[PDB]
Enzyme design. Structure first.
Site, PDB file in Angstrom:
ATOM      1  N   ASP A   1      33.908  -3.871  27.032  1.00 44.32           N
ATOM      2  CA  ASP A   1      34.804  -3.212  27.978  1.00 44.32           C
ATOM      3  C   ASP A   1      34.066  -2.820  29.249  1.00 44.32           C
ATOM      4  OD1 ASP A   1      37.203  -3.397  26.537  1.00 44.32           O
ATOM      5  OD2 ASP A   1      36.738  -1.596  25.366  1.00 44.32           O
ATOM      6  N   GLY A   2      32.790  -2.454  29.125  1.00 45.48           N
ATOM      7  CA  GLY A   2      32.009  -2.151  30.312  1.00 45.48           C
ATOM      8  C   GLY A   2      31.890  -3.348  31.234  1.00 45.48           C
TER       9      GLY A   2
ATOM     10  N   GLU B   1      39.619   5.876  34.093  1.00 48.37           N
ATOM     11  CA  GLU B   1      39.886   7.265  34.448  1.00 48.37           C
ATOM     12  C   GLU B   1      38.951   7.724  35.560  1.00 48.37           C
ATOM     13  OE1 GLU B   1      38.006   6.787  31.166  1.00 48.37           O
ATOM     14  OE2 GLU B   1      36.667   6.699  32.907  1.00 48.37           O
TER      15      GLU B   1
ATOM     16  N   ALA C   1      40.214   5.769  25.846  1.00 49.92           N
ATOM     17  CA  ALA C   1      38.814   5.886  26.232  1.00 49.92           C
ATOM     18  C   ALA C   1      38.442   7.374  26.284  1.00 49.92           C
ATOM     19  CB  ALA C   1      38.596   5.101  27.527  1.00 49.92           C
TER      20      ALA C   1
HETATM   21  C1  UVI Z   1      28.112   8.590  29.049  1.00 49.86           C
HETATM   22  C2  UVI Z   1      28.747   7.281  28.675  1.00 49.86           C
HETATM   23  O1  UVI Z   1      29.313   7.115  27.595  1.00 49.86           O
HETATM   24  N1  UVI Z   1      28.749   6.339  29.617  1.00 49.86           N
HETATM   25  C3  UVI Z   1      29.862   5.417  29.778  1.00 49.86           C
HETATM   26  C4  UVI Z   1      29.590   4.019  29.225  1.00 49.86           C
HETATM   27  C5  UVI Z   1      30.820   3.227  28.779  1.00 49.86           C
HETATM   28  N2  UVI Z   1      31.631   2.665  29.872  1.00 49.86           N
HETATM   29  C6  UVI Z   1      32.312   1.410  29.535  1.00 49.86           C
HETATM   30  C7  UVI Z   1      33.484   1.494  28.639  1.00 49.86           C
HETATM   31  C8  UVI Z   1      34.489   1.536  27.990  1.00 49.86           C
HETATM   32  C9  UVI Z   1      35.787   1.566  27.334  1.00 49.86           C
HETATM   33  N3  UVI Z   1      36.956   1.431  27.949  1.00 49.86           N
HETATM   34  C10 UVI Z   1      37.890   1.631  26.929  1.00 49.86           C
HETATM   35  C11 UVI Z   1      39.295   1.714  26.940  1.00 49.86           C
HETATM   36  N4  UVI Z   1      40.040   1.552  28.030  1.00 49.86           N
HETATM   37  N5  UVI Z   1      39.916   2.011  25.777  1.00 49.86           N
HETATM   38  C12 UVI Z   1      39.177   2.218  24.686  1.00 49.86           C
HETATM   39  N6  UVI Z   1      37.852   2.160  24.556  1.00 49.86           N
HETATM   40  C13 UVI Z   1      37.264   1.862  25.720  1.00 49.86           C
HETATM   41  N7  UVI Z   1      35.915   1.812  25.981  1.00 49.86           N
HETATM   42  C14 UVI Z   1      34.903   2.071  24.981  1.00 49.86           C
HETATM   43  O2  UVI Z   1      34.201   3.239  25.308  1.00 49.86           O
HETATM   44  C15 UVI Z   1      33.194   3.316  24.288  1.00 49.86           C
HETATM   45  C16 UVI Z   1      32.119   4.260  24.747  1.00 49.86           C
HETATM   46  O3  UVI Z   1      31.312   3.698  25.778  1.00 49.86           O
HETATM   47  C17 UVI Z   1      32.782   1.862  23.990  1.00 49.86           C
HETATM   48  O4  UVI Z   1      32.845   1.626  22.587  1.00 49.86           O
HETATM   49  C18 UVI Z   1      33.832   1.020  24.739  1.00 49.86           C
HETATM   50  O5  UVI Z   1      34.399   0.002  23.922  1.00 49.86           O
HETATM   51  C19 UVI Z   1      32.313   3.696  30.672  1.00 49.86           C
HETATM   52  C20 UVI Z   1      33.479   4.351  29.959  1.00 49.86           C
HETATM   53  O6  UVI Z   1      32.976   5.255  28.958  1.00 49.86           O
HETATM   54  C21 UVI Z   1      33.987   6.211  28.717  1.00 49.86           C
HETATM   55  N8  UVI Z   1      33.371   7.466  28.299  1.00 49.86           N
HETATM   56  C22 UVI Z   1      32.462   8.220  28.993  1.00 49.86           C
HETATM   57  N9  UVI Z   1      32.122   9.334  28.392  1.00 49.86           N
HETATM   58  C23 UVI Z   1      32.857   9.310  27.215  1.00 49.86           C
HETATM   59  C24 UVI Z   1      32.950  10.209  26.137  1.00 49.86           C
HETATM   60  N10 UVI Z   1      32.242  11.335  26.050  1.00 49.86           N
HETATM   61  N11 UVI Z   1      33.785   9.890  25.124  1.00 49.86           N
HETATM   62  C25 UVI Z   1      34.468   8.743  25.191  1.00 49.86           C
HETATM   63  N12 UVI Z   1      34.459   7.819  26.154  1.00 49.86           N
HETATM   64  C26 UVI Z   1      33.630   8.163  27.144  1.00 49.86           C
HETATM   65  C27 UVI Z   1      34.830   6.324  30.000  1.00 49.86           C
HETATM   66  O7  UVI Z   1      36.191   6.050  29.682  1.00 49.86           O
HETATM   67  C28 UVI Z   1      34.227   5.259  30.927  1.00 49.86           C
HETATM   68  O8  UVI Z   1      35.269   4.641  31.678  1.00 49.86           O
END
Ligand code: UVI
Ligand code: UVI
Ligand code: UVI
Ligand code: UVI
EC number: 2.7.1.23
Lengths: 261, 261, 261, 261
Positions: free
Chosen positions: D45-46, D120, D159
């Site tokens: 997703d990233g 977001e 997310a």
């Molecule tokens: C510090 C850090 O984590 N750096 C970010 C690195 C990841 N990225 C890429 C992604 C993505 C994504 N996009 C989706 C999506 N649309 N729907 C479902 N899963 C998704 N994912 C899943 O999120 C899981 C965790 O990386 C992975 O397994 C992906 O499969 C940034 C995205 O991290 C999200 N976030 C940041 N603090 C969070 C927190 N504390 N808790 C939960 N979420 C958090 C935020 O949304 C941002 O937009």
């Protein structure tokens, strides 16, 4: 000494019980389901709960042991295949005993009745709206409006308490924890929201505001109490004792039940 | 004996402090901000936090007292107008002392450093993703991915812990409580979710998985620690002492702060 | 045109109703509680709920208006002292109508029955354990074990839904929201946990796993349904209409009810 | 038409990309990473987030496709082994396009800057206390004190929003959802607590109370903004388009990611 065995009643449990009874016969082990000193429970946490309550009047004179024929339990944390090794060590003895706190519930009328919970005691309404004043050590703390309240032992915190947002606490802490079920909070109505963790000797008391009929539960059994004036919760002076043969730390049981196994 | 007074520095606090100092002069009360036996804090909970940390090296030889010039505090629970009656009783003495548990934090490098928290100690990431392995008494419990973790004293449970969903616990319980900040939970990543309440002598340890730079906070102060190998939490052997002149039960302080006053 | 007035039945409400009826008589306003075109509700949100259900069969031919004689309501958002100005504008007319979505519930047996909710429809167990399979547009989504489920209209999101952790959503969104009541989650049992917000035309269906007896509620009324095979939720094709004389935005009503007024 | 392919950069992703490029060469498919009409993302997703932002200026002229070489993603929901069948259908065409709403963020200074979020946009403090006034359509709704706020698209609700307690909403709903990070709530400080779901055309505005420096994030990137006067959130007039070859319903993606697969 004397021992007994309860079973969930399915074929696995009954057969394992009959097998264990035969192994005990090969020692100086006499089956007595009246005044046993060892109570073995075969099945799940419910089966163990039922065994605790069957013998709640001789808690000081009994050590409990749980065998899970299904998934791992919190009280029945021994596997069926270790059963023979279990009968062995139960006979030679020398095991240590471990004690968990219990919860005392008193229900007053206009007469009294007390219960002992291993998991938790809950209160809900007989249908109508549930409104209760919560008094802590005689200080009026809050007026609760909502679905109900849950008071949990430490070992109960991984059960209903957990599903309500409560904290998990290590069973060596002599305490009880109160959680809310769907409380209303607006301009007019105000609850703390957070779970509350109480020490020994504190008394939490629930008092009716209008309706005086509540559905009160203690572990797996729910009693309707009419014309109720008060429900008193406190940490019990009585404790449950477990026969322990092996290190199986609470937090590991938690990890195995909820994280992965 | 010897005493000192800190102030928030606004006009109310400074003036009340100068007034109290004059009242003390009318007794055999000598102002010593080096080795005081009584530490008075005038302001809010932050001011009190700062006073605790100013004198954390003489905790056994000090009784603390909080005066709130703003809203009611949890540590500064005496009103400014009772100030004269306070100086009075402080001089004649005969008060009782009350003790709250504290939290010990150890940070290891590749060297060591320990801190003492009255509210809580938290860990977050220096920007990058926060991933930490959580080990309880040397048992790997979970791999935490999220914003961070919070470890709270009992008296800290009404502070940051409360905002994270933690339970409020009575300060007479020698324990610490761990809460999550926005943990990710999916098919791949698994945390307990529930807060965890630990007894004395249990050691919770956080160990890095990739990045080894974390922002660590202890009460109101946040330190960046580079090349970190471990963060150890346990209930401290040291305790904070309060001069008590009057019954003001914890649960009443809770009700007054959160329900209504 | 034709109008009617319900009252909570306390003295305030009855007297205000009789006063308003007299004011209407001074216009070409004929009281008809059989086929009214304007339904006025005097009391609280419950009184308004009862008025909606009294006339749910003529929703297209009615505009509702709420007067709160107690605290501010979400549906009864006009003050008793504005009552005369209200009768005035109701007579001359020219007001605009505002429409909120409703929730349709269908209950199938082994025969059918449908209900229309303004707040929400909930499902719980007749005492035994509540276990239901949740199917979304015919896809099996989860097996829910717990206390029950709640399906909410948008305007219902500030009611029971709110107490269960649901999101508040603006009533102009044609949607419904599902929340859990105390779901069990462990190694064996798995629910989403998060509330779910569904668009128009999606069908959420609950199907029994063992026990087929459930306590089903629709707004303030709870019906026991025996031998149930399915409960279908979808956003209704019917809508409720409000007579609006004045701007009173939903988010302001929210702020006034929950933040401060 | 024209197409391009991004890769996470690990060996799996690079090799799959080179393989797909060769398959495209066997059709009238010209690789153009400047003005592509099809953007393929290989990784997680990233990686997909990065691809969206690389081409956010030609959103109307592009259909996106996600291939997950690791676990299933929410945006990259095609498996690596279906890659050849994918190149096939991409060439012959005739696929349908699916559109998800986006979030528009505007940051004003004392000058302006707008961003577009697929997941977001969040706001936190540059270290000091985070205090912001929340204004909804110019109505002051609440004063937020805490760690920060999160505004989420529909597809973003699984997310960060999910970890903060937000509701999951189907992407066909043109809305945005606001959640709190650790808000303080006591006698003095008051937030709604519940998540808020806003429709199209509503404007949520954050305004500073003291400190005017905030860490603002948009998807995976975090910008420090100094001397900030306002942050405006609204549902964007622009939408992201997906090439769809196959039915893979959102709720199934949810079930597969969170319940079991
Ligand atoms: C510090 C850090 O984590 N750096 C970010 C690195 C990841 N990225 C890429 C992604 C993505 C994504 N996009 C989706 C999506 N649309 N729907 C479902 N899963 C998704 N994912 C899943 O999120 C899981 C965790 O990386 C992975 O397994 C992906 O499969 C940034 C995205 O991290 C999200 N976030 C940041 N603090 C969070 C927190 N504390 N808790 C939960 N979420 C958090 C935020 O949304 C941002 O937009
Ligand atoms: C309606 C109904 O469920 N009838 C009760 C039948 C089960 N029994 C036996 C048990 C037990 C138990 N004891 C423990 C324990 N000490 N620690 C951890 N797990 C444990 N378990 C596990 O609970 C899971 C659910 O049965 C099973 O998997 C067990 O392994 C009553 C106990 O149910 C608890 N409860 C009732 N409403 C609940 C709810 N809504 N949510 C969560 N919990 C709820 C309550 O605690 C009561 O004391
Ligand atoms: C960024 C920032 O806020 N800077 C910190 C400035 C305040 N200080 C002083 C205090 C205190 C305190 N100590 C107590 C106490 N023991 N019990 C009850 N209330 C107490 N209070 C009350 O906390 C309210 C908020 O300042 C005030 O009204 C006090 O009456 C640091 C303390 O802030 C806590 N915190 C930090 N992020 C928090 C969050 N997101 N949510 C809730 N709490 C949070 C943390 O605990 C730290 O130890
Ligand atoms: C057992 C019992 O309570 N019997 C029901 C008597 C009240 N009625 C009337 C109402 C209403 C209403 N409608 C709205 C509305 N649309 N928006 C905002 N507030 C509203 N209210 C406010 O709800 C507050 C509590 O009565 C009052 O102050 C009203 O101003 C039934 C409604 O109760 C709701 N509920 C039931 N269990 C609940 C719970 N555990 N927690 C929260 N809500 C719960 C449910 O929604 C049902 O539809």
């Amino acid at each position: 000494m004397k021992y007994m065995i309860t079973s969930k009643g399915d074929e696995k449990s009954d057969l394992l019980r009959l097998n264990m009874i035969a192994g005990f016969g090969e020692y100086d082990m006499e089956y007595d389901d009246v005044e046993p000193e060892i109570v073995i429970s075969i099945g799940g946490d419910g089966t163990f709960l039922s065994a605790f309550h069957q013998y709640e009047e001789r808690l000081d004179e009994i050590a409990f042991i749980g065998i899970h024929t299904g998934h791992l339990g919190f009280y029945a944390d021994w596997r069926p295949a270790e059963a023979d090794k279990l009968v062995k060590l139960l006979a030679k003895g020398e095991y240590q005993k471990v004690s968990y706190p219990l919860l005392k519930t008193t229900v007053k009328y206009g007469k009294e009745a007390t219960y002992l919970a291993l998991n938790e005691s809950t209160v809900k309404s007989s249908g109508g709206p549930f409104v209760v004043d919560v008094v802590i050590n005689d200080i009026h703390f809050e007026r609760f409006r909502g679905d109900g309240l849950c008071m949990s032992t430490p070992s109960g915190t991984t059960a209903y308490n957990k599903s309500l947002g409560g904290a998990l606490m290590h069973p060596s802490i002599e305490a009880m924890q109160l959680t809310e079920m769907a409380s209303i909070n607006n301009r007019v109505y105000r609850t703390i929201g957070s779970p509350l963790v109480f020490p020994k000797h504190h008394v939490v008391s629930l008092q009716p505001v209008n309706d005086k009929d509540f559905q009160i539960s203690v572990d797996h059994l729910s009693i309707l109490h009419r014309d109720v004036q008060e429900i008193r919760y406190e940490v019990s002076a009585k404790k449950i004792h477990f026969a322990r043969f092996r290190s199986f730390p609470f937090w590991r049981r938690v990890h195995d039940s909820f994280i992965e196994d």
